[PDB]
Each structure stands twice: as C-alpha cells, then as structure tokens.
Amino acid sequence: APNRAENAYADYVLDIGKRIPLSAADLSNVYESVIRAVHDSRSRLIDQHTVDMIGNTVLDALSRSQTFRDAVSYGIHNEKVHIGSIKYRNEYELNEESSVKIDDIQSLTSNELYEYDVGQEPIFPISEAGENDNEEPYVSFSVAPDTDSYEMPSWQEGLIHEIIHHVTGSSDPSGDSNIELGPTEILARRVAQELGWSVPDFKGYAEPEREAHLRLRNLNALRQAAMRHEENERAFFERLGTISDRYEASPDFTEY
Ligand SMILES: [Zn+2]
C-alpha cells in the first residue's frame, strides 16, 4: 500500500473499498449510526443549526457520493474508523498573533470579530480528526455558517475532509505544498464534485490562496453564527468557550 501521506493513497483506498460495497442494509445501519452520533454530539457543538448541518452533510454524502461510500466502506472493512463512531466538536483557540483585549473565549464580543487590527482575528477553529483518551474518535471543525451562505459548500467539503482522515487513515502532505493536495484532500474534492458542492479549484494543500480562503470562510462562519444568536450573544461565546475548554455544554441548547 502507498504511504498514507502520498497522493497515491487516495486511489488505493477507493480500489480496495470498492471490493466490498455497502449493501443497502449496511448503508441503512451506517445511516442510523451517523444520526445517533451527530445527535450525541450536541454537547460539544455551538448550536442546533450546526448539529443539523453536520448530519445533513454526512448523510447526503453517504446517499449521493460513491466516492464517500467507497471511503467509508474501506474503513469498515480495512480496520480504520467506522464512520458511526465519530462524534463532532466546535473547538476554538485564541489567535496568539491577535491584538484583541481578551483573557478567554468566554469574554469575546461580536464587535471583536470585526474591530481588530490587521489580519489577526481573535480566534480560529481547531480543524482536526482526533481521539479522546478512551480512543473515541472525533472531528473538531468550524461552527456551521448560515444556510445558503457562500461558505456552506467549502465548510461541507472541509468537514468531509476531516472525516476522511478517520475513515481511511489518510494524511495530509508532510510538507507545505502549493502543488500537491495530499490524499485526504484529493478524496474530499472528489466527494465535493460528486455532490455539486462548489469549491475553489486549489492545487496545493498549503497554497496561499487556499489558506486565505479557509481563514476567511472560518471567520465568516463564526460571524454568521454569532449573529444568529445576537439575542444571547454572551451565552454564545460562553458556549464556544465551554466546548473549547473540553467540557459538556447543554445538549438541549438551553442557554438560547
Ligand atoms: Zn487534513
């Protein structure tokens, strides 16, 4: 097998994954497990909108992307993460290059998402496929942007990307490349294409235009989420802080 960080790993995963397809019954079980896993992720997600969007995105990919099904099937049959085991989080971190006057995410205000100097916004999402100490896998990712937002398809594609790390064991390029996507992003882009998610045609995982697109997508998703909860702004930033501190927030979003 190719190394998990080389582009070749993508087509390898799919070739092997296609050998044992998911029956409509297998798919049905996967489907229900994802519904459960996403619902169980409420306590680490910023809002119900984000819960809904994660579920919709993953289920739509299972329903309409052969590539995603092939990747998911690969993991089930080849000792990677079974997609139904993955839970979801919206962890953020302070931007250490920033200017903004805050000790913690809990004290942040919506004004501070606009009024800061340079390109140093106060916080960034943590976007990663990790596991907790009981080896239970999770994806941390940006809060969901608004329905019908410019940011939605890129957000969806990036979410699928992190899931691909778990379900296929793929990695990103070892070096910062402007001409190689890496096998995880290759697969995520194929899923996006099959689903009609409009994303920019980047060639390199770390190319400056991609990095800029991501930061701006994340900042706007955060601004949009904060605005959705303008009525309960302090509760919104406290919840984001609670999640980022790795504690459980209300699974029923009672602060809203
Ligand atoms: Zn990645």
Side-chain angles (χ1 to χ4, degrees), residues 71-189:
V72 164
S73 191
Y74 172 83
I76 287 170
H77 303 116
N78 299 265
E79 307 288 21
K80 310 299 187 291
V81 176
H82 297 212
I83 189 172
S85 297
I86 301 167
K87 290 183 62 175
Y88 303 87
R89 312 186 183 174
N90 294 142
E91 294 179 359
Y92 282 66
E93 58 180 349
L94 295 172
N95 174 8
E96 299 299 349
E97 285 185 282
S98 190
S99 68
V100 156
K101 20 80 90 28
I102 58 167
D103 293 318
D104 52 43
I105 295 174
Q106 291 90 342
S107 302
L108 195 46
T109 68
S110 76
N111 285 40
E112 288 157 350
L113 304 182
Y114 303 86
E115 273 303 294
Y116 51 80
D117 298 334
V118 319
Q120 299 312 346
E121 63 271 39
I123 62 172
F124 299 140
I126 294 166
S127 302
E128 74 167 320
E131 57 193 326
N132 66 18
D133 298 315
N134 195 48
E135 317 286 358
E136 299 169 339
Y138 70 89
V139 164
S140 177
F141 201 67
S142 173
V143 306
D146 290 353
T147 298
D148 303 337
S149 65
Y150 169 62
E151 288 75 19
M152 188 63 81
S154 180
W155 181 90
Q156 291 179 293
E157 193 265 355
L159 180 67
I160 290 308
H161 173 112
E162 301 301 337
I163 292 168
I164 291 300
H165 278 305
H166 277 315
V167 308
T168 73
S170 60
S171 298
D172 295 317
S174 296
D176 294 314
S177 182
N178 292 20
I179 54 171
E180 300 233 321
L181 293 172
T184 308
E185 184 63 8
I186 287 171
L187 293 176
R189 285 284 298 280

Side-chain angles (χ1 to χ4, degrees), residues 20-77:
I20 311 175
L22 296 171
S23 79
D26 301 332
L27 199 41
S28 188
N29 288 336
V30 166
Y31 206 89
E32 290 177 328
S33 293
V34 171
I35 287 170
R36 290 169 68 258
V38 173
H39 187 74
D40 211 40
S41 300
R42 291 172 303 154
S43 68
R44 303 288 182 107
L45 294 171
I46 193 55
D47 62 11
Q48 187 67 46
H49 176 70
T50 296
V51 177
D52 294 347
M53 299 286 23
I54 289 171
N56 292 348
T57 295
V58 177
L59 298 178
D60 187 41
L62 288 169
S63 297
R64 297 194 304 116
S65 170
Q66 185 62 61
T67 295
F68 193 62
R69 288 193 299 273
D70 291 335
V72 164
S73 191
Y74 172 83
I76 287 170
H77 303 116

